[PDB]
Paper text:
Volume-regulated anion channels (VRACs) participate in the cellular response to osmotic swelling. These membrane proteins consist of heteromeric assemblies of LRRC8 subunits, whose compositions determine permeation properties. VRACs are composed of proteins belonging to the conserved LRRC8 family, whose expression is restricted to chordates. This family contains five members in humans, termed LRRC8A–E. All of them share a close sequence relationship and consist of an N-terminal pore domain (PD) followed by a cytoplasmic leucine-rich repeat domain (LRRD). In these assemblies, LRRC8A (or SWELL1) constitutes an obligatory subunit, which is essential for the targeting of channels to the plasma membrane.
To gain insight into the structural properties of the LRRC8A/C channels, we overexpressed the protein in large suspension cultures of HEK293 cells transfected with constructs coding for the A and C subunits at two distinct ratios (LRRC8A:C ratios of 1:1 and 1:3), isolated the channels by tandem affinity purification and added the sybody Sb1 at a 1.5 molar excess before vitrification. Of the two datasets, only the one collected from channels obtained from a transfection with an equimolar ratio of DNA (LRRC8A/C1:1/Sb1), showing an A-to-C stoichiometry of 2:1, permitted reconstruction at high resolution. Although we expected to observe a heterogeneous population of channels, following 3D classification we found a hexameric protein with nearly uniform subunit distribution in a single predominant conformation. In this assembly, four adjoining subunits including their cytoplasmic LRRDs are well-defined, with the density of bound Sb1 distinguishing them as LRRC8A chains, whereas the density of the LRRDs of the two remaining subunits is absent. The four A subunits in the hexamer (denoted A1–A4) are organized as pairs with mutual tight interactions between their LRRDs, as initially observed in the homomeric LRRC8A complex. In contrast, the two pairwise interacting C subunits (denoted C1 and C2) are more dynamic. Whereas the extracellular portion of the PDs of both C subunits, consisting of the extracellular subdomains (ESDs) and the membrane-inserted segments (TMs), are well-defined and show structural hallmarks of this paralog, the cytoplasmic subdomain (CSD) of the C1 subunit located at the A4/C1 interface is defined poorly, and that of C2 located at the C2/A1 interface is not resolved. Additionally, both LRRDs are mobile and thus not visible in the cryo-EM density. Within the pore domain, the ESDs obey pseudo-six-fold symmetry, which is also largely maintained for the TMs and CSDs of the A subunits, whereas the TM of C1 has undergone a slight outward movement away from the pore axis that can be described by a 3° rigid body rotation around an axis placed at the border between ESD and TM, reflecting the apparent deterioration of the interactions at A/C, C/C and C/A interfaces.
Numbering used by the authors:
A (entry chain C): 433 to 808
B (entry chain I): 1 to 114
C (entry chain D): 529 to 576
Write the structure that this text describes.
């Protein structure tokens, strides 16, 4: 970070695979970079490096990840377009320009081997070269830093894509083109100001959709139609305006990750225990009063986040869960700790989060056993 | 005041067509997503079709996709569901469903296939 | 300010991820920019 140039001793290793050069002016890529052949990741932050023919030939076959964070258009080296075996790319910097839009990325076409492309470049609209390179992509990440992103039938043409992330694209409403991507398996739309997500009724067109991410939005209510997505295992809808949970949502018995923290929840439906594969529960910062009995049906509940909740008493069924690996209780108005929590074989002191002045309320035998299990 | 009423149910032969009309009063049908579900005896209620609020995008149950047709007329604030190529496997009572602040299930119409 | 009050802070509309806001300026009127940007604010504090 912030050196005069490339030291010549850094070529002393063969165990290197990630190189990160940031704010290091006028670094010329020597042929001596051949001293490390297994290197596959390279970070060039705020530095357009000058390259040599042996170095370019070496990089044309033995590089996989290139990170380009640029304060200027000229800070992007041109020669990076010549590489053929690249598979991970990252372009950070506001390349959006008037009447020369997405022209700095014209050499992206030759990256046939590419599978991963991440974009944090304040792109107001979807670039055409992105559509060109989406014929064979496996992961596309777009981050506009809250800028409104417009597609208008330009994202459905990436049939081979397997992961889609449109973070802070300010869509405010799901575009239909995403439903055309039948190969798409996991979708992330974090912080896009979503208020009505009934478009999930089209999600049945995705037969391998097992994870959905629509968190950090203004979603008021969860449509019951999400019960049609039985495949889902991880569902993320926390940081929203949800006060009630539809019962039909609990038709997806495959659900394993259910995080709904920072919401207006007050009751946990009796159907929450219908999901045997439920492994992670997170309702932190809510108004939950008590744990429903069915919530203990999931014996493999390996995570439990109950913090900042108004629970009055801890149910005694918690000891019936033996796969409990971690649970946080800090921030709750509990009179005393039930001893059943102490009978979990997988539980540890570090796994448990609770106030010491109440943690001492447990009998000394249970506390000593917990400390011993924490030690080794 | 949000009221969903179903009309057009009854008995119909296999391979025929039937019109199920869902009428709404309290809310406009132009800006609201509408849903049609069905329930058969010995089986929990099953979703059939859904219609959007923008773009006239319509989805249907894969078992009956292409067999039924859902449309809406905003002037009468109604949803028309035309069922074609009927078979005994879809003998069920069909309900109109919406969520406007709260859930709303319609009266429903039982269609039997002979 | 006079005839340009609550105009120098009109850039507050650009901070889309802004949540908290505390103002201690002896003001008499709510800024229009703050009025528009408060749709996503979680806490607004004023100490006139």
């Amino acid at each position: 970070f912030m050196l005069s140039g490339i030291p010549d001793t850094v070529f002393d290793l063969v165990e290197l695979e990630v190189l990160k050069l940031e704010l290091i002016p006028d670094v010329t890529i020597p042929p001596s970079i051949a001293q490390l052949t297994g290197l596959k990741e390279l970070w060039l932050y705020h530095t357009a490096a000058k390259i040599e023919a042996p170095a370019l030939a070496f990089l044309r076959e033995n590089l996989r990840a290139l990170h380009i964070k640029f304060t200027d258009i000229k800070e992007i080296p041109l020669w990076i377009y010549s590489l053929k075996t690249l598979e991970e790319l990252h372009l950070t910097g506001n390349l959006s320009a008037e009447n020369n839009r997405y022209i700095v990325i014209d050499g992206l076409r030759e990256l046939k081997r590419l599978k991963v492309l991440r974009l944090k470049s304040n792109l107001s609209k979807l670039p055409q070269v992105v559509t060109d390179v989406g014929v064979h992509l496996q992961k596309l990440s777009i981050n506009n830093e809250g800028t409104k992103l417009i597609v208008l039938n330009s994202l459905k043409k990436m049939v081979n894509l397997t992961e889609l992330e449109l973070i802070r694209c300010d869509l405010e409403r799901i575009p239909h083109s995403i439903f055309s991507l039948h190969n798409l398996q996991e979708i992330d739309l974090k912080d896009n100001n979503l208020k009505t997500i009934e478009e999930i009724i089209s999600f049945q067109h995705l037969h391998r959709l097992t994870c959905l991410k629509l968190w950090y939005n203004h979603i008021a209510y969860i449509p019951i139609q999400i019960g049609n997505l039985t495949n889902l295992e991880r569902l993320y809808l926390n940081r929203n305006k949800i006060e009630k949970i539809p019962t039909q949502l609990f038709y997806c018995r495959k659900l394993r990750y259910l995080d709904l923290s920072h919401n207006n929840l007050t009751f946990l439906p009796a159907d929450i225990g219908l999901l045997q594969n439920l492994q992670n529960l997170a309702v932190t910062a809510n108004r939950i009063e008590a744990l429903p009995p069915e919530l203990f049906q999931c014996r493999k509940l390996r995570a439990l986040h109950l913090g900042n909740n108004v629970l009055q008493s801890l149910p005694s069924r918690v000891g019936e869960l033996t796969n409990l690996t971690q649970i946080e209780l800090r921030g709750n108005r509990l009179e005393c700790l039930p001893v059943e929590l102490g009978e979990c074989p997988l539980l540890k002191r570090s796994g448990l989060v609770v106030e010491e002045d109440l943690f001492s309320t447990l009998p000394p035998e249970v506390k000593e056993r917990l400390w011993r299990a924490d030690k080794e | 005041q949000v009221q969903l009423v179903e009309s057009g149910g009854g008995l119909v032969q296999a391979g025929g067509s039937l019109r199920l009309s869902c009428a709404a009063s309290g809310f406009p049908v132009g800006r609201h997503f509408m849903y049609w579900y069905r329930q058969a005896p010995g089986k929990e209620r099953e979703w059939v079709a859904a219609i959007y609020s923008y773009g006239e995008y319509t989805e249907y149950a894969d078992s009956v996709k292409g067999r039924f047709t859902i449309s809406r007329d905003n002037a009468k604030n109604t949803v028309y569901l035309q069922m074609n190529s009927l078979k005994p496997e879809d003998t069920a009572v069909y309900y109109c469903y919406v969520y406007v602040g709260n859930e709303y299930w319609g009266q429903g119409t039982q269609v039997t296939v002979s």
